[PDB]
Amino acid sequence: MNMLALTIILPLIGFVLLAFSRGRWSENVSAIVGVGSVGLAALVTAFIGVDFFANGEQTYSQPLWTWMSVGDFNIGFNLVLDGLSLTMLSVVTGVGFLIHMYASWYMRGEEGYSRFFAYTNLFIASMVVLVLADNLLLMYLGWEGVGLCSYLLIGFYYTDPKNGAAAMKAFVVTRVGDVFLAFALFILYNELGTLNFREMVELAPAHFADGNNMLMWATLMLLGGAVGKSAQLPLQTWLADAMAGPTPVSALIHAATMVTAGVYLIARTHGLFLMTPEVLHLVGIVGAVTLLLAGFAALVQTDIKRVLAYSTMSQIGYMFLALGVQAWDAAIFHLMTHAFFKALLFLASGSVILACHHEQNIFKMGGLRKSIPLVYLCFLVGGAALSALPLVTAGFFSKDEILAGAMANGHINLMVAGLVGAFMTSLYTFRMIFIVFHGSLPLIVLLILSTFVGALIVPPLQGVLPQTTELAHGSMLTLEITSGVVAVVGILLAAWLWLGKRTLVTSIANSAPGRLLSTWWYNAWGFDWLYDKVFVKPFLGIAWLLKRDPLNSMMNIPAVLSRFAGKGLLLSENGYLRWYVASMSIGAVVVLALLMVL
Amino acid sequence: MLLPWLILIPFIGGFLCWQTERFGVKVPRWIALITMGLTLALSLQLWLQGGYSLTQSAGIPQWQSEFDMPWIPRFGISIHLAIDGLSLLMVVLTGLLGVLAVLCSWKEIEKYQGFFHLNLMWILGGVIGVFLAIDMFLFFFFWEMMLVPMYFLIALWGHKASDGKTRITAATKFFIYTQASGLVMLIAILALVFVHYNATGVWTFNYEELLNTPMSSGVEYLLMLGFFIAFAVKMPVVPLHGWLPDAHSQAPTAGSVDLAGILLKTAAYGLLRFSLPLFPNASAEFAPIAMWLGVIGIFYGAWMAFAQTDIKRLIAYTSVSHMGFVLIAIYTGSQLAYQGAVIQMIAHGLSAAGLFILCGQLYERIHTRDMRMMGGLWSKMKWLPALSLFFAVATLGMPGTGNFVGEFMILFGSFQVVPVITVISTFGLVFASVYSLAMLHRAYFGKAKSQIASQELPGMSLRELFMILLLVVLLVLLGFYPQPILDTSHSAIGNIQQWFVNSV
């Protein structure tokens, strides 16, 4: 358990070796290096978990060195490990190992193979840094590394320019969110004087006794950073566009790494949000609005990858709703289960794309349940876990815990929004299932983890996060029955429209209000249009207006004045002698007059 | 006592490069490498001998090593050198970038390389003398005598693809800007000396004697204004910035003049050493104007750098934006902001050095610098696109590189002092990321937009790869372990900050 830094070192060494290989190595040796680095990180994580459960479940600290020290400003390179950090590290390493070996199968015969594995190794290393950070500055380093690896992996096929545009847009919105996170860091250091999480928790109530406004600003800025990284309101406009890249990078982004960072940030800084309950309720409201918006956006989508984008955004909104109703254990349990079934669904979607000659439109392919049965079975169990199918999956237990925590704390509206979101996600997921499919080791492991076997695993969150308030057993059973009935009714209703030949779908879809709503929800409720017309177009306009460097011409004005004055004065040197004598007389008159007036 | 030699051995080395040119064309480059290796060795010896890590703050002045010699005793003018942590750090950076500049022009078998090397080390000795000298007349003399070889190198040895008229115009614009700012700085220095004489009665041009000078408010403001005009042209600070992209674009195509000449910013060192301690009250009153000029400089440089079709011009505007950040850092009166400013200047020097070297080698490979004529170059070369990706990542403020450390300690100190300028500067960092991504995508990613980018290009040799990897390793070590650099400059920065905030 003293090898905590090995989970950072080994992916870094793999990234360095695969980057300096420059593709001269064969596919076998480079794949061995990359997936072996991630597998050794996962095995070291398993050993760390074993000695963590064999030492009494105590928070461990490994201070490597001191990052910076300017007087009072002391920031250290210290790693920490608690139940939340162990859960995050375990899910990141395991899901990354499965995705890495599936990518070793998947990326064969492709250029940039070693570059792909180096970038994903750096992604894994940066997220291990993020989840094993004692203070907010090392957490910001992991945040920035995760964002840079997201940018470098989304635009992997650099030849096609829309991959590059998607990567640039994703990096821009994540940098805006990280600037909000930097605002949170500046406020927290200015008030409390430290960036360590534990010491911030200790000195927050002592300093914010008579005034609790800058703490609200700091928690609001933390929420802004979280919604920037997790693709929530109002910075969700990069997800579906940024699935322009390959499949395993998408599975890594949506399952374990990119979208769960904000959830981990809110869960880790739970005390500061607990002493500012209005910001926590704002987190819950943002999650509810984003999950409903994501469900309505995934209704009218025609691409399987964008459907999975808005499904990921909907479950991230579910996690933010759980964090806003003070249900932290439910949020982390949903994080792990969503990582499992979304990794399974993304890998099976990549298998679908490879089997159907790189076709992504769901309406083109049909009757795929009999062409290949195994991928259909994995897609079925992944959709059932995503639709919260009762008594056999893990997403049902995760969402049941989330809505139980929402109901037990008096948030009736958020629980209603969660029920509507569950109906919505069952409806669109089985819509996509029936449109696509009607008309091996990682897949098996993720299929096993997608069922109730993954629900048997509980995170060791006792002692780090506060316990969710217990609901009454009769109301708990009522909530479970209502959620199961809602999911089953949604699945049967989606089978009623989309399994047979479509009557009601085309009757209301071809209507003018129906076409208006479909075009509105297809473009993510007009947020890309708003950000293009409010933030991007004035930027291009100001750049085009300023490209002539107006300040340079403003400062070159006196050079033009000097040239004009010199050319004007040179006209007096005409070369005439009588003019010279007349000018001498004029100057004599001028100096005599100036001497007389004074 | 090693400081006079530290200034002199670049000049003797340049004279030897000129003299031993008759021994052969390939001789003066070796002489220049030997004498810059010796200069860097003496700078590192002063680093290891000064004991900068365990040095307290005894108040201004506090010099680790000083040298005195009378130069013009009529005015009380002395060759007066003094080294402390900040001056030592900039001298070490000067030696490193001079070694890189000599190594970067290694492939020139031209007829008159001896005078090229002589002007190069004249520039290097001038900027070293600017860092070391504290006497006002000697500091001004170095400040304006490093200017002539810059002009001659830009005008004669500059970009071969451009006409002679454009190079002459760029060099003359740079010279007029910098020497007029030197002249108004000389007016401020002379008026300060005459005020000190009227107060006391002794001809002193010394920096330590001029600190204890009683000035009324309004006169000290004008002296500070002249000093800031000089250090605003040389930073550059908008609108006094038009010389910089013109001098960078018409610099020699090897790229040595950019690294040796302009990539060490003497203006921020002059603000820390001279503008802040000599005029504390005037700088405290001028802090809103200077900080808002820094804000305008950051956003203006970002808006230029997004809109340039020339990569060298783009990197010049990156320099404008980063030094706008440093200008915001100088006028806060904070320990953390000053230390972040020092880290940011060092990291910006290293990152812009890597960017300029890689841009020069890219121009050598493809014989053009227009960003509309290149694209999809990742599959065309071996090492250059990845290293330029690393340096473009470094220049946007990425952790693991020293730019993030410097910028974030700048912003932490600034937010401790002023919050609104801090938040606007962080949005300027967002703009910096925007222009870095734009340069990366318009340079190396996409499809080939011409025929010269559609063919396989030769790779970089071992020497340039070694120097670029050295810059990469230094940037990584600065980002992950900046503590020796922070401890080296902890005493002088503390003395400057205590003098600035204890007199108001």
Ligand SMILES: CCCCCCCCCCCCCCCCCC(=O)OC[C@H](COP(=O)(O)OCCN)OC(=O)CCCCCCCCCCCCCCCCC
């Ligand atoms: C705290 C723990 C860490 C937490 C996360 C930290 C994140 C921040 C740090 C980011 C570092 C830089 C990341 C981006 C690197 C971009 C360059 C890259 O990866 O290039 C890949 C390229 C190989 O690609 P390929 O397509 O195969 O090339 C064939 C044709 N050229 O590769 C090449 O062509 C060769 C290699 C190019 C440069 C690679 C990166 C160099 C910098 C890092 C290593 C420096 C050396 C190690 C020692 C440092 C000092 C101890």
Ligand SMILES: CCCCCCCCCCCCCCCCCC(=O)OC[C@H](COP(=O)(O)OCCN)OC(=O)CCCCCCCCCCCCCCCCC
């Ligand atoms: C903060 C503001 C207040 C304090 C200012 C302190 C002074 C220092 C900082 C400002 C310096 C400004 C310099 C402006 C000129 C820079 C050089 C330039 O633009 O040259 C252009 C041109 C030569 O280029 P070319 O195209 O070859 O010539 C045309 C062919 N006939 O040139 C020519 O053709 C003629 C050039 C003549 C010499 C240059 C003009 C000097 C005029 C006096 C300026 C004094 C400062 C005035 C206040 C600032 C400006 C408003």
